[PDB]
Amino acid sequence: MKVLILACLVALALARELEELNVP
Amino acid sequence: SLVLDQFGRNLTAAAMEGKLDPVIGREKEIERVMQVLSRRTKNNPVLIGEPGVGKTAVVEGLAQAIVHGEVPETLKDKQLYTLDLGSLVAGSRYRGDFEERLKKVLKEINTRGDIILFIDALHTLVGAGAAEGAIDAASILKPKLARGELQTIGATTLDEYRKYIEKDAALERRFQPVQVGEPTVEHTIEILKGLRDRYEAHHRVSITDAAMVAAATLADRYINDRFLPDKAIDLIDEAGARMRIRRMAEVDDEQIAEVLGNWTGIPVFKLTEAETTRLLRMEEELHKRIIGQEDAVKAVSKAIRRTRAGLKDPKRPSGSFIFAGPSGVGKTELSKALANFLFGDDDALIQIDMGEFHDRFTASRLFGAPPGYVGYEEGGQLTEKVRRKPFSVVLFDAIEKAHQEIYNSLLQVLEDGRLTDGQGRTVDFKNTVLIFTSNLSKPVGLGFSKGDYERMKQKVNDELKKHFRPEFLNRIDDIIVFHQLTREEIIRMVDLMISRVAGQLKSKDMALVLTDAAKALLAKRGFDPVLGARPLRRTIQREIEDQLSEKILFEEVGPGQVVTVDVDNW
Amino acid sequence: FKLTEAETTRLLRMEEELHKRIIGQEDAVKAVSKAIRRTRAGLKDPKRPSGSFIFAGPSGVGKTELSKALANFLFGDDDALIQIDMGEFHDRFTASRLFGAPPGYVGYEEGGQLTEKVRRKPFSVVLFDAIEKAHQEIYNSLLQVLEDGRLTDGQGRTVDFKNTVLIFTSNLKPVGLGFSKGGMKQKVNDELKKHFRPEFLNRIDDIIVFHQLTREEIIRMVDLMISRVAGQLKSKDMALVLTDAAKALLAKRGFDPVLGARPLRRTIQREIEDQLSEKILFEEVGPGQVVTVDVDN
Amino acid sequence: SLVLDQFGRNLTAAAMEGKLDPVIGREKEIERVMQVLSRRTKNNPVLIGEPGVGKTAVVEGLAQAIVHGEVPETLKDKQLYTLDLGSLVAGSRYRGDFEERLKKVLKEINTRGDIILFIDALHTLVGAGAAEGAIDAASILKPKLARGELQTIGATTLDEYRKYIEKDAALERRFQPVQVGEPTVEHTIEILKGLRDRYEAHHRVSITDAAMVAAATLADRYINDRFLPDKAIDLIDEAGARMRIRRMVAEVDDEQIAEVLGNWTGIPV
Amino acid sequence: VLDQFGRNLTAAAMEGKLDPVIGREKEIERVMQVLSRRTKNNPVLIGEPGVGKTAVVEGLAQAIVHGEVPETLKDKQLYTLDLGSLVAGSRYRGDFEERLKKVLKEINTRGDIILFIDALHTLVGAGAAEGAIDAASILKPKLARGELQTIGATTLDEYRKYIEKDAALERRFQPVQVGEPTVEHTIEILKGLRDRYEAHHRVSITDAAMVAAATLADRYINDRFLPDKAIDLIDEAGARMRIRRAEVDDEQIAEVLGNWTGIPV
């Protein structure tokens, strides 16, 4: 009864793209 | 020269080749952009606006104004480039292979000197080579943009300006918000008149001057999630492509309006003679499955005939009704019958169980939860059923069991035709038919008096004034007190209820026929003025439905034609 | 900016241009027209909002219609009216629609449905329709809005409500309890003192209790509502002409002091434009023909 | 051509090979798709619909309408590709690999010009190839979709159209919502009668006409977690799949589907 | 499908390395009934954790070798698949999706694969989100056309929270309810498994041990289910006998139950 649910959204755990180090 | 060609579209060369659609109107903003571009230190107009209002058309209108000579002598003969940030990221693998290629761009703009970049979708600029706290396409441009040695027009959706540009407010400084507002109805007519040549040529079909007056007015009031200088073009092209589909003539008011009837669901087209007879025969078609209740059948037929004739208020619903009366007389049967006239099925009726809103806090089922609460991913159980179906009959079944604070969420529903959900999206109820059935017995008063429909209409009208606020009954169009079902009306409801029982027997490959002695006996045992048509419904269940349900299982009545005959009467 | 010669005359005509839509309600118009004259004469208080009004009064006499006539005056359409329908806010926690979610909760990125309407348009008429039907601490979130002129977003941005005109249309049947001569405004004023928290009433610039629409104003209201159905909804090459006995019959049927102008609007869709919609579908009188309306009885 | 084959499946070539089941009905829905696809700008339909009503089946009806030539001439000889967005994210560890793979798709579409790029699960486009510093596949396609230089059909659940396409209000403009509705029961019987030969051939059973009439009326009356043009096929399959099971021909009848539905909801039908 | 992310349960069943499955013969028929469908042939095994849902499939993988197939499940290899093992090792973009498109490429080329994925609560949100590319967006076009036969396993709560809350995932996995077995069914499980436990521990498990292990486990243990809490008692008692060294009875499984639960004697 009128106890509110508090969604509490997480920060985005997401992928990462890459700069790569060039080699021969 | 060709460095910008492989990462951007030369939009000035697109205007010389006539590849840009003619931007008619929004030239008070093309001059506003040129006032920002001719500045000294920060000359970078971001075109913010609602999605579809012609933000990227202003720059296409600017790139046409370069080659027309409409441009002043401070931006005269400047090659504009729509820089594709996705093409700058593409072709990178290694470290620096984005940041080198963006410095190749700015080395050319320093060299060539008449370049106006257009970052369409300027929110893409933050986080384009790495994260926001690293070297990306934003952090490279920020020393160039604040000096004024780089002119860069941006364009961002207003919702995406607060989420990505204003989130890192250092980039927001370098740009000037040039507010691109939505066109008016009168302004988007002449937008469509200039665009008529490009869509008459692609679809090989003429477009009437009336059809673009139609596609501006019909897109304004009957679309409430898009924006005008795009949702009007949607009605033109889909009717333009409807005409070149069937011919594989011209585009009328009716050709635009039957596209919108297939896009929303709202019947805004001019009625054919076969259909408009059914609109005049609406009472007699509603009386096919409701019996009696003639002042209510007239009242909801007046609301739809006013809607189809186009005489309803454009800022209000099609009809707002309270169906008050004794229980069982067809408050909900009629709301299903009205939903079968308009659609064909009674599950297209949006039945809101309004008796289960007895708590004072279930109003969040109608408009969703506010931000910070789960139930935010869901816009609501009422808003999202009309965001999908704008032309509806929204039945609020048995309203007098809910709390007074559920009614207050439905005030602006009735007067303004709006209901903004918790996630910030107003939903038009301007095309719904809002039915509020109220169940508000003993065939005497309390005390000494001289006295159905007499001393009950004035009774329940004062019980609505007592239960509701006078602001809610103010907004309801018609309040129809319902009659108690008379004896001659129960006899015709036998014919309705048996014909479903016989309809249950058509699947068993038989049919049920009743005699006039036996339909009278069901009506004599099914009549009750204070509970009407459910004691008839129970009598057929107790004396016809289950006794035939036994005789099917005896194999006594198989698929032969059973006739139910009276036991004895008179 | 210093006003155009046309805009100077229009703004002195501001009462008589807002009376093109608002029939009657004369002190309601010349309380909200003076607030725009203060803003445009360079006499706006640079801390306080431009106008702060409680349009209290009886239901249907033009509370929302004046907020729309004001928004059409200042912008050209009443769709530029920021209308926050306060009946949606029934409990304490829908105040997170005024300023958005706090950090760490869903809907934090969208940052409010009132604050972001004013970051785009800081000059705005902000309508709070049916503010009585909000919770007792929805409007306690607007106690810095109406003196300090700003509301801190959940994301952390104070937004200027200074150049806005805030309007709180509160909704305040026949005679009250007991013996009284005649038959009111002080009943409406003191009900605001019992409902609203007098921190909120001191921040309101003007509390305007609206009038009953008189019969001489309902006759003028008939001409306004017939002007809706003709010309905007009878662009079918059809013209709607009403005889002066027909507008008198609509006024005698649509006039009840206690509601005002919605019983007139329900009368027109019961006498005029539902009988007319039966005549268009039957094509008794159809597209390409002038409709006259003679008096029925 | 070869670029599109490794990032998606040609549905037109799949309709030549007869790998797409017959789409009986949906004539007015495919006509609405071909109407939207024949536009000059924003020629991008989205089959929004309840989950299982045949959203991806309408496009399968379009892929075999191109092979039959029942399309208009503006959509004749179109190659309809189901764009596998997972194939584009696959092998995109480094920055700019996804954005290269998506611009290589679009360079082939501008070259050929006869490509209708069906993107099933269009809600997955918002965030497709979105990394820390990347460009999502929405923002690459938004200039293409707005100018009508990329014909693209979407197919999105109505629940998944709120959460990911109406939360990206720019991308919602670029598309046209073609409401694929839940069909009526009489339409579903014609769906089931048209799919009679596909499930006769795989379950090796003859399925009678009353069994098709039952499994549309029995599913609509007694199953509510699914939608009509699917929960009716569902009763046809587990009818015939039980006859492949217990026999290790026998006709599928009203009794053969009611005993499936009795073992389905627990409702004795 | 490689042996990197799972193993071939039919090649294990051909070599006889899987557990003998006594009981659950009716549930295997319901899995074969869902797998014999032309479309949507995806049986999710809804049952409490450790009721024998893999033991349904281990018996199903034997039934491929034993020839109890409906001729549409004939010579179908059944590679199990840890869906979380594809997730493990993904911090960069296209790490999960490449290893998921590889294992779906090795089904179209090979052509007889029946995936057994456990943990379908992990399916929703296997990538970043649903608007992102997850395994509950890659599998779904092939789970509606019958071109991909995946056998699932949820609990009942994971099925309610992750699949019944997911639109367009209820219709692609068809529920097969693997129930909680009774006490006599559990003894018959133990009678079939005893040729493995008496040959692994090199002990002799008496008949009195199993009638006690199916009774004492229900009587004293409530956080975990029967066809596992009863298998465990005659497993550790064989290991405790191997450690103390041979015959397991209702006294040898006795002190094994007393080790865990807070019983001093």
Ligand SMILES: Nc1ncnc2c1ncn2[C@@H]1O[C@H](COP(=O)(O)OP(=O)(O)OP(=O)(O)O)[C@@H](O)[C@H]1O
């Ligand atoms: N002033 C205008 N004159 C002519 N056409 C216009 C005008 N404004 C928009 N359009 C038309 O709008 C269509 C494309 O939409 P528009 O350019 O408005 O998108 P937008 O405002 O850039 O929206 P978004 O930010 O979503 O891309 C084109 O057909 C274009 O010609």
Ligand SMILES: Nc1ncnc2c1ncn2[C@@H]1O[C@H](COP(=O)(O)OP(=O)(O)OP(=O)(O)O)[C@@H](O)[C@H]1O
């Ligand atoms: N006027 C009517 N016409 C046709 N059927 C009616 C009518 N009145 C009642 N019925 C029948 O009575 C049954 C239930 O009545 P209905 O659904 O109309 O409820 P209602 O009038 O809203 O009353 P309440 O909500 O108090 O039960 C249905 O079988 C319906 O067909």
Ligand SMILES: Nc1ncnc2c1ncn2[C@@H]1O[C@H](COP(=O)(O)OP(=O)(O)OP(=O)(O)O)[C@@H](O)[C@H]1O
């Ligand atoms: N002063 C007025 N001038 C013109 N029309 C009026 C006026 N008052 C009422 N009307 C007519 O009746 C309608 C009701 O007016 P309005 O929307 O302002 O109601 P309100 O006073 O806000 O009532 P409520 O208490 O229900 O909110 C108007 O839209 C108009 O059609």
Ligand SMILES: Nc1ncnc2c1ncn2[C@@H]1O[C@H](COP(=O)(O)OP(=O)(O)OP(=O)(O)O)[C@@H](O)[C@H]1O
């Ligand atoms: N009109 C139709 N004609 C023939 N088969 C149809 C029709 N509509 C649906 N089906 C069949 O019913 C099933 C519907 O699944 P389908 O994926 O096509 O629909 P959907 O609603 O897009 O589902 P999802 O959202 O899961 O992709 C398929 O087996 C399809 O072949």
Ligand SMILES: Nc1ncnc2c1ncn2[C@@H]1O[C@H](COP(=O)(O)OP(=O)(O)O)[C@@H](O)[C@H]1O
């Ligand atoms: N007929 C059977 N039913 C259930 N479990 C069995 C059966 N035969 C053997 N087992 C045992 O089941 C276990 C396999 O795990 P399982 O019970 O399938 O886990 P889950 O039920 O959580 O999927 C092993 O201990 C195996 O020996």
Ligand SMILES: [Mg+2]
């Ligand atoms: Mg744009």
Ligand SMILES: [Mg+2]
């Ligand atoms: Mg009002």
